Amino acid sequence: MRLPDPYTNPEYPGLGFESVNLVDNDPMIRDELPNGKVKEVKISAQYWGINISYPELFPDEYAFLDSRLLEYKRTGDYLDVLLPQYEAFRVRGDTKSVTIPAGQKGSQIILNTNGTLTGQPKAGDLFKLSTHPKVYKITNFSSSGNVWNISLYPDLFITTTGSEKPVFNGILFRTKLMNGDSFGSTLNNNGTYSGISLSLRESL
Number of Cβ within a 10 Å radius of residue 104: 20
Q: Which residues contact 78 (CB under 8 A, 6 or more apart)?
A: 1, 133, 174, 175, 176, 203
147 is a site residue for a copy of itself (CB under 8 A): no
Residues 19-48 binding a copy of itself (CB under 8 A) are 19-28, 30, 32-40, 43-47
Q: Which of a copy of itself, another protein, none is residue 183 near (CB under 5 to 8 Å by kind)?
A: a copy of itself
Tell me the site size for another protein, rule CB under 8 A.
34
Residue number with CB closer to another protein (11 or 32): 32
Kindly tell me which residue out of 8, 95, 192, 203 binds a copy of itself, with binding defined by CB under 8 A: 203
- Supply the minimum distance, in Å, between the C-beta of residue 57 and another protein: 24
Q: Which of a copy of itself, another protein, none is residue 152 near (CB under 5 to 8 Å by kind)?
A: a copy of itself
What does the angle CA 113 – CA 118 – CA 123 come to, to the nearest 5 degrees?
A: 85
CB 135 within 8 Å of CB 48: yes
x/- map, 175-194, a copy of itself, by CB under 8 A: -x-x-xxxxxxxxxx-----
> Parallel, antiparallel, or unpaired: how do β-strands 135-143 and 108-112 relate?
unpaired
Residue number with CB closer to a copy of itself (74 or 96): 74
123-to-86, 90, 93, 99, 111 alpha-carbon distances in Å: 11, 12, 19, 21, 16
- 162, burial (CB in 10 Å: exposed 0-12, middle 13-18, buried 19+): exposed
CB 121 within 8 Å of CB 138: yes
Residues 70-89 binding a copy of itself (CB under 8 A) are 70-71, 73-74, 85
Kindly tell me which residue out of 88, 110, 158, 167 binds another protein, with binding defined by CB under 8 A: 158
Residues 87-126 binding another protein (CB under 8 A) are 105-107
Residues that bind another protein (CB under 8 A): 25, 27-47, 76, 105-107, 155-159, 181-182, 203
